[PDB]
């Protein structure tokens, strides 16, 4: 009977989810104690320099906080879903806010990487590894948090696949979307912190809603441009503005391969407009300013991405319209004299 099969397949996903959660917790711990705590061990102090000891928080980011969360809350909560795996979605929904800690770890990861590029050879590490009987280096364990947050989505999608007829399929779908939401937010923010040359508080632009690289043409009113040959710009869609930056693929020393973005201009959402369809190319749309006196023809890599941007811009323009509506309604009620 198909029901029995799916129930059995649901069990397999729960087992993998639970077994992998445990290995994850144990692995963070063996490194927190086998490396981090060892940086403050007198018996070891003669193998590590003080420069490295002070950069401990940069090397491990907030791994301890992550460990504590999983080892005191999440693992325990997953274990309470064993008898009914379909309800594991609720489990995630209840802790969505807690996962926000992954943003911190991910934003710091490249920083930690830079440090590891210079002290990976350090005798302290080679020593700690021998004591642990580990065959893989520390940085490989430092990747685990990044790898873990990017599997939950896979696991939830799988559970959902075997729970389409289960009471709880809705929570699974919402948990999946929410987890994908956090992964998107974190990934998006990695681009944001790489913006340079911006005079002001990026936090005042409101939430970052979308980011991506695009080919862009300009069709500004008569009286940097890209009239015929498109220019490359990385756009950041915030609630209050659209930022245009130029990707600085240029490097230096100790080559960080992650490119940075040089701020070029900002379009205030209050005067932004959009054009959903462009002739000849289904993946093009337009973002114009001050009623088309400035027009940017954006070419998305895919039609789906174009749609994602049009929808997000429209949600923002819609909320802007309602906000003004409400505003001109309260001060309109001032007819009290």
């Amino acid at each position: 009977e198909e029901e029995e099969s799916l129930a059995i397949l649901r069990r397999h996903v729960m087992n993998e989810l639970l077994d992998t959660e445990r290995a994850y917790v144990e692995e963070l711990l063996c490194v927190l104690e086998g490396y981090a705590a060892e940086m403050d061990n007198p018996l070891m102090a003669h193998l590590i320099s003080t420069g490295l000891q002070n950069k401990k928080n940069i090397l491990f980011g907030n791994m301890e906080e992550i460990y504590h969360f999983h080892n005191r809350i999440f693992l325990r909560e997953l274990e309470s879903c064993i008898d009914c795996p379909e309800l594991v979605g609720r489990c995630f929904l209840e802790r969505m806010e807690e996962f926000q800690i992954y943003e911190k770890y991910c934003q710091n990861k490249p920083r930690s990487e830079s440090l590891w590029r210079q002290c990976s050879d350090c005798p302290f590490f080679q020593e700690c590894q021998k004591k642990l009987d580990h065959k893989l280096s520390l940085d490989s364990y430092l990747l685990k948090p990044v790898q873990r947050i990017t599997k939950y989505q896979l696991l939830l999608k799988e559970m959902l696949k075997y729970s389409k007829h289960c009471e709880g399929a809705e929570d699974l779908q919402e948990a999946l979307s929410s987890i994908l939401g956090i992964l998107k937010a974190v990934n998006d923010s990695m681009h944001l912190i790489a913006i340079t040359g911006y005079d002001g508080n990026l936090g005042d632009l409101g939430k970052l809603l979308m980011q991506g690289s695009f080919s862009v043409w300009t069709d500004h009113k008569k009286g940097e441009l890209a009239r015929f040959k498109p220019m490359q710009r990385h756009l950041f869609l915030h609630e209050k503005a659209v930022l245009f930056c130029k990707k600085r693929e240029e490097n230096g020393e100790g080559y960080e391969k992650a490119p940075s973005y040089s701020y070029k201009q900002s379009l205030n959402m209050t005067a932004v407009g959009i054009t959903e369809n462009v002739k000849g190319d289904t993946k093009k749309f337009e973002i114009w300013y001050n009623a088309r006196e400035e027009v940017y023809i954006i070419q998305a890599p895919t039609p789906e991405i174009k749609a994602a941007w049009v929808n997000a811009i429209r949600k923002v323009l819609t909320s802007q319209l309602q906000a003004c509506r409400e505003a001109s309604q309260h001060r309109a009620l001032e007819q009290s004299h």
Partner: protein, 188 residues
């Protein structure tokens, strides 16, 4: 013990995880295909000396261009995978993957790896490809791409039957043992 870092990249659904599990457990996951493959250390013998073949999966990170590169530092060899029954995954090899590992790891060699070759004989699969003017990717076409993208070699395998599977990793170990070299235009 010297370590060889091997990172498996490629589109989601091309069998990256399955491939790694099949190779490390020596048996295809018959009942349930696991979703997770944690960093694995495989001791391998080279010149009568023990080496650690470190295997890294990237499944789940395909859609995140800022988290995804975090796995690349100090990679000794990349496995750029695409499913032989998925033309779009093959196109992404050229449009997305090689350009990316080439940027982050200029001196790191990579192999073009065609997966799921068993599906070239799966009726259902070929029928779906048919209802879209598509046919499976042929070894010849893949070998040309490998040549043009300066990949060390093109290799294909099946996680299911394990045909070609072990050879993929042997080739990866060989490519990694090569001295730091700039991409080269192979012959043939």
């Amino acid at each position: 013990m010297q370590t060889i870092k091997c990172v498996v990249v490629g589109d989601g659904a091309v069998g990256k995880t399955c491939l790694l599990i099949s190779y490390t457990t020596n048996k295809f996951p018959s009942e349930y295909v696991p979703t997770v493959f944690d960093n694995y250390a495989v001791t391998v013998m080279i010149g009568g000396e023990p080496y650690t073949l470190g295997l890294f999966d990237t499944a789940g990170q395909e859609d995140y261009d800022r988290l995804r590169p975090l796995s690349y530092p100090q990679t000794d060899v990349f496995l750029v995978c695409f499913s032989v029954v998925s033309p779009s995954s093959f196109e992404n090899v050229k449009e997305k993957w090689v350009p990316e590992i080439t940027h982050h790891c200029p001196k790191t060699p990579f192999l073009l790896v065609g997966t799921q070759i068993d599906l070239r004989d799966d009726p259902s699969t070929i029928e779906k490809l048919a209802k879209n003017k598509q046919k499976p990717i042929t070894p010849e076409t893949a070998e040309k791409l490998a040549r043009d993208l300066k990949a060390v070699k093109y290799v294909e395998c099946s996680a299911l039957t394990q045909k070609g599977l072990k050879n993929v990793f042997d080739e990866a170990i060989l490519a990694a043992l090569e001295p730091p070299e700039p991409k080269k235009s192979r012959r043939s």
